[PDB]
Design a protein around this nucleic acid. Structure first.
Length: 114
DNA sequence: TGACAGCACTGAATGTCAAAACAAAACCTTCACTCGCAACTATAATGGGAGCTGTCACGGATGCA
């Protein structure tokens, strides 16, 4: 029942509030108990990383800002830490992703509309 | 049985050298067209002015005289 409210706030707050699990522990419950409370609902929450990589991927293709704002806008640690997450997930360079004139759904994790 | 607390373990990823790479093209040679300096030519013709001035005028100065 209760932690429905985490789902689309996370659609809205992968932004300027740097939310970690202890910042996600501000949703009422503990660090370890929110995990399995999210697990049997969804199957897959720390999804957040995907939204961070999905949520950064609105900035590559659909806004004209270059790459250095992107690795620090949507709450990743660094430009290699971004591309470490990028290459584990999308298996590309984002300089080889946005510059390419074609773009399809290989690595971009969907948001949970459960 | 009830909901919910916070530890246990697992794996993925984060931080690690590395050369694989592509482009800032800036740093070098090219090859040249052109822009640049240097030399000659052999009826024969032999003193500059040069368009300007426009009359200030004393006390002073020296130079001669």
């Amino acid at each position: 029942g209760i932690i429905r409210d985490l789902l689309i706030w996370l659609e809205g707050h992968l932004d300027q509030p740097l939310s970690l699990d202890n910042v996600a522990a501000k949703a009422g419950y503990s660090k370890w108990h929110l995990q399995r409370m999210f697990k049997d609902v969804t199957g897959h929450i720390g999804y957040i990383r995907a939204r961070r990589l999905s949520k950064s991927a609105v900035a590559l293709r659909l806004t004209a800002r270059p790459i250095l704002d992107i690795a620090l806008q949507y709450r990743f640690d660094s430009q290699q830490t971004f591309t470490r997450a990028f290459k584990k997930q999308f298996a590309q360079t984002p300089a080889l992703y946005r510059r390419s004139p074609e773009w399809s759904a290989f690595g971009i994790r969907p948001p949970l509309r459960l």
